[PDB]
Paper text:
ARS2 is a direct interaction partner of CBC and together they form a platform for the assembly of co-transcriptional complexes that determine the fate of diverse RNA Pol II transcripts. Our structural analysis shows that ARS2 is made up of two regions, residues 147–270 and 408–763 that co-fold into a structured core with an intervening glutamate-rich region of unknown function that is likely unstructured. The human ARS2 core has an unusual structure comprising a largely helical ‘body’ from which project N- and C-terminal ‘legs’. We find that the RRM domain is required to bind RNA, whereas a basic patch in the C-terminal leg of ARS2 mediates the interaction with FLASH.
Based on the incomplete model, the N-terminal helix was truncated at position 171 with the aim of producing better crystals. ARS2171–270+408–763 crystallised in hexagonal space groups P6522 or P65, diffracting to 3.2 and 3.5 Å resolution, respectively. Selenomethionine-labelled protein was used to solve the structure of the P6522 form using the single-isomorphous replacement methods with anomalous scattering. This required merging data from several crystals to obtain a sufficiently strong anomalous signal. A nearly complete model was built, making use of information from maps calculated in each different crystal form. In mammals, loop A (538-ASEPGT543PPLPTSLPS-552) is highly conserved and proline-rich. In most crystal forms, the loop is disordered presumably due to flexibility. In all crystal structures of hARS2 (except that with loop B deleted), only the first part of the loop is observed with 570-AEEEELL forming helix α10 (‘EEEE helix’). Remarkably, all crystal forms containing loop B, irrespective of space-group, exhibit the same intermolecular crystal contact, in which the acidic ‘EEEE helix’ and the preceding short β-strand pack into the positively charged cradle formed by the RRM β-sheet and the C-terminal extension of the RRM. To accommodate the same intermolecular contact in different crystal-packing environments, some angular flexibility of the loop B structure is required.
Residue numbers in the entry:
A (entry chain A): 173 to 269
B (entry chain B): 409 to 537, 553 to 577, 599 to 762
The structure:
Amino acid sequence: NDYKLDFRRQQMQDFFLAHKDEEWFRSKYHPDEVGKRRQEARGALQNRLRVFLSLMETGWFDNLLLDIDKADAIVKMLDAAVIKMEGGTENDLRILE
Amino acid sequence: LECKPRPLHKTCSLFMRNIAPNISRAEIISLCKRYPGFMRVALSEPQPERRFFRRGWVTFDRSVNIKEICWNLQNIRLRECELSPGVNRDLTRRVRNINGITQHKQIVRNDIKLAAKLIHTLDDRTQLWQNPILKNITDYLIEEVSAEEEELLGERDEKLIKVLDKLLLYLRIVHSLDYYNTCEYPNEDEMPNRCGIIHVRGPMPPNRISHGEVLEWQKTFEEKLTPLLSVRESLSEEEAQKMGRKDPEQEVEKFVTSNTQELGKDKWLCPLSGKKFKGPEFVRKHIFNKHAEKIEEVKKEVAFFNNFLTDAKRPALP
C-alpha cells in the first residue's frame, strides 16, 4: 500500500483528464497531431536547408567569420536569410544595399 | 523593367503576455486574419509555474500600422482570457559577443568535434537528406606536426575557423541552434523575426591564455551542450505497468463488451448503430466490420494516453 505511487498516478490521471482537449497537449502525445506537426516541422526545416545552401553558393559566407569585427556583415547575412526564408528572389535582396 | 524589392526581413508584430492553454492557434489566427497584412501566429511553450499559460506573438506586414491594430485588439477576450496585446519592438543587439577564448586553436579544434556531433544527431533526429559539410570533417580534428624534423635537429588559426563557421552557421540557420550561447530557439520559424539573435566570438584576451584554463573551458562548455542532444526520457517496463499502461487490444475488448448490451433474451442492441441482434458474437462482427472507424479511435486514445504516461519528463504541476 504505497501512498506516493497512488498520488503520482492520480495526479497523472487527473492531469490527462484536465488537459485532454487542449491543443498544446494533443500536439505532444496524440498520434495524429504528432504525425501532422512533425511533417509540418520537417517541411519548414527543409525550406531553411535550401536557404543555407543558397547563401553558400551565392557567397554570403564567402568572406564572413563569426567575429564582432564583422558584426555588420553578420546582421546583413541574417536579413538575407530571412528574405530567402520568406520566398524572396535576388531582386528583393537589393534593399540591403 | 523589373519590380520593386520587398523588405521581408523587417516585420512589426504584437505580443500577448498571458494566453490560456484552452485557446488554440486557429482562434488567434481567425481573430487576426480579418485585419489586413496578417502573416502568422507564434505561441511559446506553456510553463507549469503559470498554470500552463503561453506567451503569444502575432506577426504582421511592415506596411500596416501596428499601433492601431494593437488598439483595436486591446479590450477583446477569447474564450475567457483577455489577450490585451502590446507592440513588440525590433531586436536591438543581434550580434552578441561571448568570451574571447573561443578563437584559440585548441577550443576551435574541440568545437569542430562538438558542432559536428550536433549536426550528425539533429540531421538524423529531424531526418533530412548525407550532409556535404561533414565530408572529411575528422581530417580537421587530427593534428599535423613536423615532429620528425624537430627530433633530428635537437592563437588564431584561420583554416580551422573557416570550417567551424560553416557548421555553426548551418546549425543556426537550419536547426535554430545558437552554438556559442548553447541554446535552441525552436519556435523561430513562426516568431516575428525568423532568424534573430546570433552569438559571436569575443575580441581577444588581454593576458596569456593559461594551460589548464583551456581544458576548463572545454569541460564547462560540453556540460552546457549536453541537454541539447537529450533523447526523450521514458519509464521502465515495470514502472509503466505500475502507473497503469493501458493495453491496446484489451481496452478495445472493453469497448466491445460495453457496447454489446443485452436488451433481453435473444436481443442484443448496441448503442453505436442502434440495431438489434440475436447473440453477442453477431454484435462483435458488426462492430469490427462496420464500425472500423471507432475501433481505430480507441487505439489512438490508448496510444495518446500511453505516450503521456511513458514520458518520464512529464508535464505536471509544480
